[PDB]
Every structure is written in C-alpha cells, then in structure tokens.
Amino acid sequence: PHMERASLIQKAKLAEQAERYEDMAAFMKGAVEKGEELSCEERNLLSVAYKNVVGGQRAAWRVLSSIEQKSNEGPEVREYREKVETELQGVCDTVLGLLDSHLIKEAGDAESRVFYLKMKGDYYRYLAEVATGDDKKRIIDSARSAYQEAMDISKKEMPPTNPIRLGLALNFSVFHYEIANSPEEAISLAKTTFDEAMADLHYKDSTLIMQLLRDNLTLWTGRRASAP
Amino acid sequence: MERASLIQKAKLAEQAERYEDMAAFMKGAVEKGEELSCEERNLLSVAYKNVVGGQRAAWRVLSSIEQKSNAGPEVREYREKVETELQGVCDTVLGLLDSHLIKEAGDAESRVFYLKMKGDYYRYLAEVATGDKKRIIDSARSAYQEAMDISKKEMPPTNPIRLGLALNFSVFHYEIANSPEEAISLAKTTFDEAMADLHTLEDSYKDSTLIMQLLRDNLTLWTGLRRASAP
C-alpha cells in the first residue's frame, strides 16, 4: 500500500513531465486515498494536476458560453456547453470530495490547512462560475467560508510574503470582484495584500503573485489573473 | 441532420481546443456515410493529429526517461499504458480510412489525402511497434507509395497535400525504414521541383510555403533540433 502509494506518486511525476494532467490527477487522487498526508511537494502535484484539468474545461466553457451569447440575435452550442459544464462539475466535486473527506480533516499544520482551505474556496468558486439555481448561493457561501477561514489562519500564522497567503488573497480578491460582485472589497484586499507584502523584502514565486496583483489592480481601476 | 450537428459540434470543439471531442464528432459524422468535403477532411485530420500528437509526445518523454534509467518499473508500465492508448487511436483512424474513407474517395485529391493519412497512422504505429513491425512498416510504405504515384500524375509539385506527403514519406524513409539517402533525396527533389514550378503556386501559398520551410529544416538537420513532419 505505501509500496503502491510510492508508485502512484512516481507515475504522477512522470505524468507531469509528459503533460498528461488527467492521468496525473488520477494518480494523485489514488495516492491521497491510500491515506497518508501529502508533503510540501506531493501537495503541489495534486494542485497542479487538477488546476490544469479544470483550467482547460473552464477555458472551453468560457469559449462556448461566449459563442452561445453572440448567437442571441443553433441548439448544438447549448448542448455542448452543458456537456462541458457537467464534466467540469464532476471534477470540482471530485476535488471537493477529497478535500472534505481526506485532506482538510487530516491537515495538522497551519500551512497545509491554509493550502487546502484555499483549494476548497477555489473549487467552490469554479463551480460558482457556471452555477445555476438556489444551489449557487450555497456554493458562493461555502467558497466564502473556506477562503475566510484560510484568511484568518494565514494572518495569524504566515508572513505577508508567503506565496500561499499572497496567492490566497489574490484568489479571494478575484472571488470578491467576479463572484460576490464586491469590486471595492476586491480592490481593497488586493491593494492591502500588496502594500503589506511590500514592507518588507527579500519565496521566488511570491514575486510572480505580486506582479499579478499589480496587474489586477491596474485592470480593475481601468482577463483578470488568479493564482496558479 | 445529425451529421450536420456533429460537424457543427466538431467546429465548436476546434474553437474550444477539445480535440478528443472533435475526433469523436468527426468519427460519428464519417459513420453517417456521406463523403467528406475539403473542409470536413481537415477537421477530421486536425482532430486526430492533435490527439495522437499529444500521445506520441508523451510516449517519447516516457521512452526517453525509461532509457536514462538503464531501475523503477513505473516508467515501463506507464509508457505501456500510453502506448496502448496511442495504438487504439491509430487503429480507430485506420479503421475509418479502410472501412469508410478510402473506398468512398472518388477524386484523386481526396484519395491522396486519405492514403497519406493511412501511411501516417501506420507510421505512428511503427514508431512504437516491436519486431508485426515489418507488416506495419510495409502497410505504411504501400499507402505512401500509392499516394506518391497518384500525386505525381494528378497534382502540381507545389500542391500542399503532395508536399506534405513527400515530407512525411521522407521522414518515414529517414526514421522508420532507415534509408537516410532516400529521405534526403526525396526531400531535396520535392523542394527543388516545387521551386522550379513556382509559376503554378493562389490561395494555399501559406500551407505550401510552410511545408517547403519544413523540408529545408529537415534537410539542414539531416545533413548536419527535433525533425519536422507535416501538420
């Protein structure tokens, strides 16, 4: 079983080098299901895999949704957009299932707890991107609680230059602007995060997030970025 | 009707870069029977070219790692998984060409396109095959050679399907049949003959010049980083 777990993680690393993210996701899912807590590295494999999988589906959904909107003045677009929507929901539910049933409960330290709660907020946010019904409100609130719980921990346990916190703030400020429709909160959070991280420097990818905040702020004052 | 919707969805999947879906839709549309127009053949080929392209690239990466490790059995196992998947896609494409497209192809242009495709997909099987390999190599050779005979008789030396065919047949000679002289010969000849007959070059000048650029690249590589084949 740990013998197996090791092979699944090795195959997940191979799948990353071969850019076979659906396979990578499957291997990491299986490895998480062996029980063992994921390390610094192993966690990033999990997130990379699902980020790329869902990223492609989201991009496709946006393209199709955009075409469906231009045609308002062909039933195939709606049907195919629904197919992509369904697939994407399945992946988000899979990720949310792992986070709730395995990863968040088993996360001992604050770093990993932040990491998983940010992930939780992200995947509820991606469902909210397509969400339709009374369910949308629940999804939005489940996303809010996850990011807010993560914000409370990160403010108490991490410096303003930490990339999980910087990256969390980024994604929570995107949620505020797009999902919750609170562009003031969004801008506020992004400006505060940047300014607090700027005093003082100086852990390599932190600069990339800061570059993305600068970009979002310039955009929102006059496609928005989200953390990788 | 259903055919029209499948083709419309194949065009949507192209715009959304969902090539596995695109392939599935074009497969279904071919299975409605109707012959493919010029636009439709390109959708079919784009879809499967991208699908198989990703699997081949992954196979190369894994095969390269498997070679550097000589243990770790996971690389072999996962390379075999990718190999199996890849074979499934090639068999699917060859099944379509043999059972539906080549028999139903009336004109020479479409016949050459499908025979080149046939050669291409037997060549991708040959890239991974072991020992069946001889039959595969020969099935690939016959398809390309039949396509070459028709193209020389029916198409100008600047036609992009003819140039593409020659480029891929020369890659077949260099990599698969292990005939670098034939490969270089065919590539040089194809380039020089297209160059001489430029007065017969209209609307496909992007596709043709691109393939001529790839012939020059391969010639520069083979005389003295990764080799090019037609998209």
Side-chain angles (χ1 to χ4, degrees), chain A, chain B residues 1-224 226-231:
Chain A
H2 171 68
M3 293 300 293
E4 293 160 39
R5 191 181 182 272
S7 294
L8 292 169
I9 283 147
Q10 195 44 70
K11 291 188 189 190
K13 289 173 181 184
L14 296 172
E16 191 176 34
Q17 292 187 68
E19 311 182 23
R20 296 259 296 178
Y21 299 107
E22 293 198 60
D23 292 354
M24 196 181 170
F27 295 135
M28 288 311 299
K29 181 179 187 296
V32 167
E33 287 169 0
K34 303 301 172 169
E36 249 172 290
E37 298 165 35
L38 299 198
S39 65
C40 302
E41 185 184 9
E42 291 156 8
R43 283 190 308 259
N44 295 342
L45 295 167
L46 180 69
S47 191
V48 160
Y50 282 104
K51 183 74 72 158
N52 279 273
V53 168
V54 88
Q57 294 170 324
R58 288 164 65 215
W61 187 92
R62 289 201 296 280
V63 167
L64 298 174
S65 185
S66 153
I67 292 162
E68 187 173 25
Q69 256 60 70
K70 292 152 176 186
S71 79
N72 296 347
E73 324 75 41
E76 300 93 13
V77 194
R78 180 182 64 80
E79 286 175 8
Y80 184 47
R81 192 262 304 145
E82 285 167 355
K83 157 163 155 44
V84 171
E85 189 169 298
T86 297
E87 265 196 41
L88 182 160
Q89 286 163 352
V91 169
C92 292
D93 291 342
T94 293
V95 175
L96 286 150
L98 293 177
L99 286 172
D100 291 311
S101 77
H102 285 274
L103 303 172
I104 294 160
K105 47 166 86 166
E106 296 171 6
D109 62 307
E111 173 200 42
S112 62
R113 268 204 77 84
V114 174
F115 188 86
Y116 296 132
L117 294 162
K118 188 192 154 276
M119 216 177 182
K120 184 164 182 187
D122 294 322
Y123 283 86
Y124 273 121
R125 168 162 66 83
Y126 306 151
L127 285 148
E129 283 177 352
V130 311
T132 159
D134 272 337
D135 238 65
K136 194 186 198 209
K137 206 220 178 58
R138 298 184 253 275
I139 288 164
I140 289 172
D141 289 325
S142 311
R144 167 171 291 104
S145 319
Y147 287 126
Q148 195 62 65
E149 186 172 350
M151 284 288 295
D152 299 335
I153 297 163
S154 72
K155 260 169 272 131
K156 294 168 172 97
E157 310 280 43
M158 299 166 138
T161 58
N162 176 280
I164 303 172
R165 184 175 161 189
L166 287 167
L168 143 66
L170 171 53
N171 285 11
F172 195 31
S173 87
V174 165
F175 169 87
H176 287 307
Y177 193 101
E178 284 193 321
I179 304 294
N181 182 34
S182 306
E184 303 87 345
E185 279 189 88
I187 288 163
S188 154
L189 172 56
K191 220 204 228 85
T192 290
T193 302
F194 188 94
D195 295 354
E196 286 185 0
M198 204 70 177
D200 91 330
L201 311 321
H202 313 39
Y203 71 150
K204 317 311 304 180
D205 318 57
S206 292
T207 55
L208 175 50
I209 304 330
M210 285 198 74
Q211 286 171 322
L212 303 178
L213 286 152
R214 191 69 271 181
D215 292 356
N216 274 350
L217 283 162
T218 308
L219 171 65
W220 296 340
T221 57
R223 180 170 189 278
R224 35 46 59 134
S226 54
Chain B
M1 48 156 358
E2 273 273 332
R3 192 182 182 272
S5 294
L6 292 170
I7 283 147
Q8 195 44 71
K9 291 188 189 190
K11 290 173 181 184
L12 296 172
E14 190 175 34
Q15 292 187 69
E17 310 183 22
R18 295 260 296 178
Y19 298 108
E20 292 200 61
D21 292 353
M22 196 181 170
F25 295 135
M26 288 312 299
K27 181 179 188 296
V30 167
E31 287 169 0
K32 303 300 172 169
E34 249 170 50
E35 298 166 34
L36 303 204
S37 67
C38 9
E39 184 183 4
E40 295 164 354
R41 290 202 291 276
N42 296 338
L43 294 168
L44 180 68
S45 191
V46 160
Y48 282 105
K49 184 74 72 158
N50 280 272
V51 168
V52 89
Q55 295 170 323
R56 289 163 65 215
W59 187 92
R60 289 200 296 280
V61 166
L62 298 174
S63 186
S64 154
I65 292 162
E66 186 173 25
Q67 256 60 69
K68 292 153 176 186
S69 78
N70 298 304
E74 301 93 14
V75 194
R76 179 182 64 80
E77 286 174 8
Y78 184 47
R79 192 261 304 144
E80 285 167 355
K81 157 163 155 45
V82 171
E83 189 170 297
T84 297
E85 265 196 41
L86 188 165
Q87 287 163 351
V89 170
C90 292
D91 291 340
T92 294
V93 175
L94 294 168
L96 287 175
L97 293 160
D98 292 311
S99 76
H100 284 299
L101 302 172
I102 294 161
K103 47 165 86 166
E104 296 170 4
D107 62 306
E109 173 198 43
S110 61
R111 268 204 77 83
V112 169
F113 186 75
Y114 297 136
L115 292 163
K116 175 187 160 305
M117 224 174 133
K118 183 165 183 185
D120 284 341
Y121 283 87
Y122 273 119
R123 168 162 65 84
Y124 307 150
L125 288 171
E127 283 177 353
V128 311
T130 68
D132 238 64
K133 195 186 198 208
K134 206 220 178 58
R135 297 184 253 275
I136 288 164
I137 288 171
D138 288 325
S139 312
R141 167 172 290 105
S142 320
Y144 285 136
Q145 194 62 65
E146 186 172 350
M148 284 288 296
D149 299 335
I150 297 163
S151 75
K152 261 169 272 131
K153 294 168 172 97
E154 310 280 43
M155 298 165 138
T158 57
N159 175 281
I161 302 172
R162 171 163 172 185
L163 290 165
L165 165 53
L167 172 66
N168 285 9
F169 195 29
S170 87
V171 165
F172 170 82
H173 287 307
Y174 191 91
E175 282 194 320
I176 306 299
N178 182 32
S179 306
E181 304 87 346
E182 278 189 89
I184 288 162
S185 153
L186 171 57
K188 221 204 228 85
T189 290
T190 302
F191 188 94
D192 295 353
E193 286 185 359
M195 204 72 178
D197 241 25
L198 275 174
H199 132 261
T200 74
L201 176 276
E202 55 163 64
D203 16 71
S204 224
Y205 84 159
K206 302 236 168 76
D207 297 294
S208 295
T209 55
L210 174 51
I211 296 155
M212 285 197 75
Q213 285 170 325
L214 303 178
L215 290 162
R216 188 66 244 259
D217 289 357
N218 284 355
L219 283 163
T220 308
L221 170 65
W222 297 339
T223 58
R226 204 278 196 169
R227 155 284 305 190
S229 52

